[PDB]
Amino acid sequence: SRRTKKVGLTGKYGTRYGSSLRKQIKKIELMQHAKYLCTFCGKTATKRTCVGIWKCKKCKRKVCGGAWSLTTPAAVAAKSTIIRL
Template sequence: MTKRTKKVGIVGKYGTRYGTSLWKMVKKIEISQHAKYTCSFCGRTKMKRRAVGIWHCGSCRKTVAGGAWCLLSGRMEHSKLNIPEPRI
C-alpha cells in the first residue's frame, strides 16, 4: 500500500476535523501509546499497553501498572530518582 499521510501520520484518521494544534498534541500521545517499551524484568523491548495504565510484557508475561499513555509518567520517573537504593 502507498503512504497516504505525509505530515500527519497516525492522526490522519481524523481527516480535516479538530484543527492542527489538537492533532499535534494527539499525535505525540498516540505515538507514545502505541510504542513498545523496555521491560524492567527481562530487559527486552516487549512491553505493550493493554488498557489505560496496564502494561504487559510479551516475553516474560509480566503485567504491571504504569502511566496511561506511556509506561512511566513524568511523576513516576521523578519519584524513582528521589528513592534511594537499599544498602546491603
C-alpha cells in the same frame, strides 16, 4: 511509499477536529502504542493494555504505569528520591 507527509496515524481522523488538536495528540501517538522496554527480560516489547496497566510481549507479567507511557517523569523522580536514601 510514504503516503502521509506529516499527519501520521492521525489520518484515521480525516479532516475532523482541529489541526492543532490532532497535532497536540501528535506529541502522544508515537508513544501511546509504542513498544517500551521490559525490565524482566530486556526486549523492548511492552504494550499499552489499559489506562494504567502495561504488559510486554514475553513475560505475561503486568506493571502499573502511566496513562500512555510505561513510566512518567513524576514517578521516576519520586523513585529516585526514595532509592537515594
